[PDB]
Amino acid sequence: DQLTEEQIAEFKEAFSLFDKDGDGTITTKELGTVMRSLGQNPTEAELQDMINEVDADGNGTIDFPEFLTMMARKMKDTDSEEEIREAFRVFDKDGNGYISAAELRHVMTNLGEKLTDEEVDEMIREADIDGDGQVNYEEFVQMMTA
Amino acid sequence: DQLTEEQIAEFKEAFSLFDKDGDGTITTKELGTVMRSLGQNPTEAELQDMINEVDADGNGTIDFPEFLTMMARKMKDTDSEEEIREAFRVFDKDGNGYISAAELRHVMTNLGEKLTDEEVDEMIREADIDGDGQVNYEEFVQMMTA
Amino acid sequence: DQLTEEQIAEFKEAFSLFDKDGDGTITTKELGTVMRSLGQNPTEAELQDMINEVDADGNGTIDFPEFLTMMARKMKDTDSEEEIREAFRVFDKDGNGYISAAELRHVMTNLGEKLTDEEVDEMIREADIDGDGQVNYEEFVQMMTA
Amino acid sequence: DQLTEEQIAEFKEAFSLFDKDGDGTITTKELGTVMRSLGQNPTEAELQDMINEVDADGNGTIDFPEFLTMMARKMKDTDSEEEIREAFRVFDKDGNGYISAAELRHVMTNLGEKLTDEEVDEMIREADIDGDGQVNYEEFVQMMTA
Amino acid sequence: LGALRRRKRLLEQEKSLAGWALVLAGTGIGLMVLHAEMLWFGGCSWALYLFLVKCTISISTFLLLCLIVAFHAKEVQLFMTDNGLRDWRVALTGRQAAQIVLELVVCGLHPAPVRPGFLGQGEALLSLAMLLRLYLVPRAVLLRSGVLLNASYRSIGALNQVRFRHWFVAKLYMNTHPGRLLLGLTLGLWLTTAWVLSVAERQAVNATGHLSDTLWLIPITFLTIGYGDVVPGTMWGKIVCLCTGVMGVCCTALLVAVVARKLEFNKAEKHVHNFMMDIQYTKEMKESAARVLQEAWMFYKHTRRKESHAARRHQRKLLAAINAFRQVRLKHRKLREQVNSMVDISKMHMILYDLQQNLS
Amino acid sequence: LGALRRRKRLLEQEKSLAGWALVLAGTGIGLMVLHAEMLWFGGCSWALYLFLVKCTISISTFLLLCLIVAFHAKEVQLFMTDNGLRDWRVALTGRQAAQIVLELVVCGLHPAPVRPGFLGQGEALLSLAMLLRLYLVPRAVLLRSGVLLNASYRSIGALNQVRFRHWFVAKLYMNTHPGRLLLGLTLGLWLTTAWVLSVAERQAVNATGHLSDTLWLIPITFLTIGYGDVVPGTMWGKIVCLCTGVMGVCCTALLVAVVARKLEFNKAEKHVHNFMMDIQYTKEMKESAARVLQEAWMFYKHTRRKESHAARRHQRKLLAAINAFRQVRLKHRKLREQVNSMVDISKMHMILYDLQQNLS
Amino acid sequence: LGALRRRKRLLEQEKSLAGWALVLAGTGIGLMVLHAEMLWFGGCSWALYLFLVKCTISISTFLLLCLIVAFHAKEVQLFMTDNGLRDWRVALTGRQAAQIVLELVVCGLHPAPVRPGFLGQGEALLSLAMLLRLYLVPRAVLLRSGVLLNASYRSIGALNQVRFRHWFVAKLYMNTHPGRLLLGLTLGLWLTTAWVLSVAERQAVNATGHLSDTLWLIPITFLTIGYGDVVPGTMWGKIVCLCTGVMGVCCTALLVAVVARKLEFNKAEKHVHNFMMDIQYTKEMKESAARVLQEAWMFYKHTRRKESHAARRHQRKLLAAINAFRQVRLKHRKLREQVNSMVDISKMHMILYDLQQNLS
Amino acid sequence: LGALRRRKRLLEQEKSLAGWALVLAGTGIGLMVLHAEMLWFGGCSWALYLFLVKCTISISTFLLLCLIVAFHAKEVQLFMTDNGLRDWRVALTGRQAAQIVLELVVCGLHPAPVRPGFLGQGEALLSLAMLLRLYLVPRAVLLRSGVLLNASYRSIGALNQVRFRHWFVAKLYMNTHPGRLLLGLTLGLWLTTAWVLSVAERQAVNATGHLSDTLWLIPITFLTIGYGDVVPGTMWGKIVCLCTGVMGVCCTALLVAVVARKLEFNKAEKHVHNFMMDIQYTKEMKESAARVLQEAWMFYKHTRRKESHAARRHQRKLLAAINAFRQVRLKHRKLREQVNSMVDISKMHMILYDLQQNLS
Ligand SMILES: O=C1Nc2c(ccc(Cl)c2Cl)/C1=N\O
Ligand SMILES: [Ca+2]
Ligand SMILES: [Ca+2]
Ligand SMILES: [Ca+2]
Ligand SMILES: [Ca+2]
Ligand SMILES: [Ca+2]
Ligand SMILES: [Ca+2]
Numbered sequence A, B, C, D: 001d002q003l004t005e006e007q008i009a010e011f012k013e014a015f016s017l018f019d020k021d022g023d024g025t026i027t028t029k030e031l032g033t034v035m036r037s038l039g040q041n042p043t044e045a046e047l048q049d050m051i052n053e054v055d056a057d058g059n060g061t062i063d064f065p066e067f068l069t070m071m072a073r074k075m076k077d078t079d080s081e082e083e084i085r086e087a088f089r090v091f092d093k094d095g096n097g098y099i100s101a102a103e104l105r106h107v108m109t110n111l112g113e114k115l116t117d118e119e120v121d122e123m124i125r126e127a128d129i130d131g132d133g134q135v136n137y138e139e140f141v142q143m144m145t146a
Numbered sequence E, F, G, H: 001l002g003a004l005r006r007r008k009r010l011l012e013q014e015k016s017l018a019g020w021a022l023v024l025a026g027t028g029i030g031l032m033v034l035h036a037e038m039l040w041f042g043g044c045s046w047a048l049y050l051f052l053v054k055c056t057i058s059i060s061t062f063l064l065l066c067l068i069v070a071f072h073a074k075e076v077q078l079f080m081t082d083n084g085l086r087d088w089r090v091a092l093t094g095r096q097a098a099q100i101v102l103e104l105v106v107c108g109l110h111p112a113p114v115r116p117g118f119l120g121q122g123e124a125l126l127s128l129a130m131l132l133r134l135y136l137v138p139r140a141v142l143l144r145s146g147v148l149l150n151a152s153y154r155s156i157g158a159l160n161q162v163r164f165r166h167w168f169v170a171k172l173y174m175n176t177h178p179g180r181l182l183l184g185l186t187l188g189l190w191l192t193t194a195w196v197l198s199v200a201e202r203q204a205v206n207a208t209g210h211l212s213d214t215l216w217l218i219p220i221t222f223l224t225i226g227y228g229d230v231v232p233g234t235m236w237g238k239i240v241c242l243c244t245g246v247m248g249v250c251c252t253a254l255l256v257a258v259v260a261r262k263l264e265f266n267k268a269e270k271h272v273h274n275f276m277m278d279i280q281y282t283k284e285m286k287e288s289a290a291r292v293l294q295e296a297w298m299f300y301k302h303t304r305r306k307e308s309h310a311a312r313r314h315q316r317k318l319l320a321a322i323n324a325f326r327q328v329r330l331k332h333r334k335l336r337e338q339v340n341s342m343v344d345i346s347k348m349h350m351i352l353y354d355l356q357q358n359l360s
């Protein structure tokens, strides 16, 4: 690892705040009680979403290798991933993890500078890598990242 | 319709606040949750009365043709229908949708300038178009409008 | 009655505040809801005591003849009956409607100017009209009224 | 007893605040309701611990001979027993009424001036009068009192 | 039940006497300014009109000295009826006798008609001691308010255990309309003091102090904006200014408190304000997101054609559109906490659900 | 449904006729300061240039009167449309005629061109009476703001009975920018009063009351820091200063309240502050306990090895380590109680338990 | 259990050894004002009297030091008894020596009798340095008040960890009667400073500063109404005036807040006020509805039988009646809404229902 | 994960480059003050030493400009590292160039050494324009405090969206030590303004505006106790006095608010006070009841013995005791209601019962 010893110690100390039980993993109850202490009252679905948006292996728990990566992003001020994923829910009137043609049409051809039906269709075709009508989050992120 | 396009658009946008589900009709739950957001805690009977005082067809739901008529009255400042219907409940000690002779007698021959029994009887006879002792809201509104 | 018409009308109007149902009698529920409106939260035993301390016939309800007598006492500022009945509960460590010798002995021979056992016994004998050890409220009130 | 009459009377009057029922002993309910009046909301385990830390006979109740001893300690300002027993719970990560070698090692060889493994082992051996690895509260208090 | 009659009759009688014992005091105070000012703008020319007034201000006091005694007799006669006594030697304590004697001597100080234009030392104090007759106002106002006679108002007050005195009526009048009382009191204290300060610094040789200068001096001291153009020059004029300053320091704060309190919102418009701000934010976010996405697409399409500066411009615009979107999102998220915590909404729904569960 | 069409035309007509009746008032007020300054710094040398300016302010007032009458001729037609009447003799009430006459009289005072540099009493009073045309600002601001015409505001307010008026809009503007309004008003008044005070006490022989001294006098009186270097010297200059002081007393309090409010913590930062202070206190306690124990161990060792001064030093250090530990523990306990009572963790847990019980 | 007896005996001894050290300090302070004023109003004809007065203030200082040392010895002995030690060389810390030395030095400055009416710099500074012996008041007040020796205060406070100190006693003495303390402090500070400012700038011939002018200067500076008639002339009076101004600015607001708080309603009177306003509004609403419903029939029966002017009058009065009814209805609805969420007429019912559900 | 390491090294570099840009500004300000004082208290004698102090402030300014230019490169590098860009031409926004130019031209004004004790106008403004370099303090205090580098603050705040900035640190510093900051700010502003006011007006022929009078004038204006002994005499001193008054009006209010807040009770002592007051009222009632009963018994005794005066005295004492009992009873009832409200043991029991019902 490129990090020094002091940084590793600081990150381990920060992790120990959430992993108070000492098991070595973070579960829903610990995050829930930390949020309760902070003042919020999260729901089960919200806790599950916030604990699943970070883990990569999929075991349902978060450990240090999957926590250092998350901590590497919250330190910087000007984020460019949360503000991209939060421009996805606004457009997402479908209710699923996809964007339909009508949503893009009535959100873009009207708001701001009015677009055209041909331009909207071209954008939908370009975004639809697989050719399906719906647009997944992967194609969305790829299109905006370029 | 004598209204222009902009007025129709504004009224439709105002309607969309209450008809958030998009069904095209307003039910008890939507009005109840709007009132909850505003701060009040209405009861079922109050919600039913406030949702039935406007509809004319009687289907139990309120749509745009029965909403524009209601909106045509709340804009003006000096109302002359709410203040007339609220002069009906004060006299209405009967408990039903009617006014008896004794109520009018003891509320009018005493309050303000004292009236007379003959005058009260003449007024009751004039109001009673059907000749019945009780006075309905229709004859009440007709007498006040003249 | 020695009262004039205006006083009778005022007292009837005051009574109508408590007898809102129009039955002609005051029950526990009406007094309870008036006290709820005023801010207090009385209990069933307290309501029963406050509604039984006034009635004389014993039917469990209070009407105008038993209400005018009560109203004749709350108007004056310097009471001499409530302050006498509230000097009864303080001494009453027995728990019943009677005063024992030990209570009087340890409340009077110690507090204020110390009394004597002979004086306490003489006072108890004088108060005990029936000769029983306990002292009822009637003898207490009679002794203090003299 | 070396105390005078006035001090005994004052302590009895202080005791009567807690023993309101007059039984002659203090139980959990009376202390609980006094704490409720003061503003706190103690739990059953906390009440049991606070009522068992004082009694010596073990009958589960506290009377005057076991109350005067407790009152002889709360009067002085600079305590040296509560601050000694509260330096026991901080080290006590075992969860039982004992101190293990690892707890002392990682709490003392690191905090403040760093100690040594040999010094920690010597201290543990000196504290362990019975020779067992764990250290009881008796040996702890004895070591600090010296 | 003759008590309920012998109390009303006595209360009405003593109300009439207490109302008629104020006109005489007002006339007595009034017939002193017309004597002092006449003696100032006059002298030996008016030698009989300075005797007629000083003889009238004794006839106007010999009746007050009897009205007070009559009122204090009726109060004892009412107390006897209240307690059901028979002998009047029991109902009189020592404190009441002290109060009666103090009132008799306080309401009996006036310039005695037992007689170059100056109020000689000795009677100026007596004249200025006739301003102590203002303790009769509360006694003549409480008996006339009418809350001591309602039958529907002494039982609601009895249940809650409240007693009616000179303070409850004062609180009621203060809280019915606080601005009027302050605006009518600060314009009375600025004028009943400008004459007391004038009588203590009248100068004959020149206009060192009079009503032309005190009317300018008093408000300046009251507002603590003391300039220094005119200053008092007598031991008796250097205490009135201190009293005025002490009163003003409190009056100004009492006024500014009400002025600040008036401008605040009530509980029936803040909810509407929050609702209509939420409606605006929920469309500002939609406005910003579309610009972000279309700028991204423009950048992609221009860089697909090997452009040089178009891609740079589009990227630079994107990096600010993102910031604007972030700011708007943060504002909306902050406001949602207030609209879901201040008006409760969820708490009201939970209370309704608990009530429904208790019912069934 | 014809009312909804015939109201939004009359309201726009009223908005135009009320926005075009303020430009003429502004021009009329402007063409008076110029005339006064020209007469002061000029004299009898310029007469045609004064007769032109004193004649323009009649042409610029006839139009204002006509516009006022025209605007007041629309609130009767609006009332007729609202109530469905047919004869205009019924719509007009008693008070409206008095209001119209008062408005015509107030908006019709100006120096009449019916004619050594000075202003006479009548002309000066008429000129200073043209500052009463500032009551038109609220009427021309309420109509222009788009709050009486939205189809959403009037629908939401019906359920809560707000009845949008002047006061609601004024409160909204006050609460949107609390600081800017005060910082603008306190500068507008300081300059619009320094000229009214200048015109009252201009001096010809020597410059003793011109605009170069009132600009220093007015803020000093406003801040109640009255020095005494310059004081007003006329009956009409002794009232403006009092008005300025009265306004300043309230303005200072209104400003300091907002300034104090701006620095307070919100509800989303005290929680973080407490959650970090708790960790700090726990670390401090764990640090102090170790020293408390090691000092006792050193004392026991040096006592076993037959030493005196070392034992004394260890005793003295132990008796202070205990005190430090006690202080830290007492500090920690109160913050733990606040955490258990401020953020209401127990209350949130109880609410969640009640919700779960209601669900099951 | 001899520890309790020893503690009580030592505390009783300290209660007197710290009460007899205040009389000597008071006498030493008193015998300096007399000496200074006798030297001012006297001269060279009071040599032996001045010597006697300056020797008495040195005799009455050799006992204060002994009392202080005895009190500190008793405190050390009490600490030894509390901790159960045996050698006094351990109880003393590293700061008690500094405290004792500082107290001995501070309580040991006086005009030394080691000797045209004036005080030299050294003697004036020493005399004005004897006003620092006022730090003994809290120490002699805390011990005398019976809160430390009570057997119930310490038992109740153990369950809450109050740790009675100077601040708790001061808080109780302030909360028992805030007004008396404020008036006493103000009247003491207006007089104990008027003598220091007098001695700072006494003038020999044509006295520009004395007790006749400082008594007027000090309150004016205290109230921030600085006129400018008299101003300090030396460098040692300006500091005193600044201190007085700071103290006044800090002290006025306490009295302001107390007076503002005194006038508020109680929790047992607002409910009665609302419960009677309800009846009043109901009566008014019914009264207005009666007129509204008579006028319509009046208009109808005057219109059916021909006639025009009577119909016009009735129609015009109908609208005013409707307007009045609307105003009264809105006021009553607002009052009911305020009552619903202030006295919580339904919260008590909900709590009772929850208790009943829990019981059953 | 080299981004974290790069950010750490850059944030450590730009802390030293921001802490070394304040020493130079302090040195420049000090040299300017020394040069001004030497010019005033000198002249042609110090004709050479005014060419060295006037030359060092050019080297210091050049070094400061170099450091300011160097600092803004690291921030751009930090932005590039955060966003992962490769070309620096994209990370420069329009506003940042204006910020850099303004910071270059504000920190570059000084007396240019391009050259009788009177500071000629034209460079006095330049010498007084070097007090604008105090905007560097926050930028060198925020970076030095270790809150931006802690690995726990940035993790806790992410769950609450605090976004640590200048304002958060300022609020934390204000809340930690609210007392010392006010004293420090007041004692700094009472001295950094007394020199500007001295340089603004400094008479040469007669010393009438030097530092011996401004130190007395500034606090008087600050406290709004303007006497009038000394007043400013130029157009550049009046603005300074107005600014001082404006600052003082807010500072005094803040200090008074803090002092008033300090003395209030906490939540852990009011309960003890209420409990110990109830324990005493419940004894006062018992004390009074016994006297009532024994007086009644004595009155009943002295009535069968044909005694009159004894019976009258006993009757009066009975009435007095009955009167005295009522006040204590009412006070006890009110205190019982108060202790049953807002600290309700009934509410605590209801919460416990609800928790028990939820559990079972
Ligand atoms: O202060 C206390 N009073 C107590 C305690 C514990 C038990 C009992 Cl019974 C009493 Cl009266 C206490 N804490 O240990
Ligand atoms: Ca875990
Ligand atoms: Ca994982
Ligand atoms: Ca719907
Ligand atoms: Ca329908
Ligand atoms: Ca009934
Ligand atoms: Ca009955």
Ligand SMILES: [Ca+2]
Binding pocket: D018, D019, D020, D021, D022, D023, D024, D025, D026, D027, D030
């Ligand atoms: Ca017991």
Ligand SMILES: [Ca+2]
Binding pocket: D055, D056, D057, D058, D059, D060, D061, D062, D063, D066
């Ligand atoms: Ca036991």
Ligand SMILES: [K+]
Binding pocket: E226, E227, E228, F226, F227, F228, G226, G227, G228, H226, H227, H228
């Ligand atoms: K002045």
Ligand SMILES: [K+]
Binding pocket: E224, E225, E226, F224, F225, F226, G224, G225, G226, H224, H225, H226
């Ligand atoms: K002032």
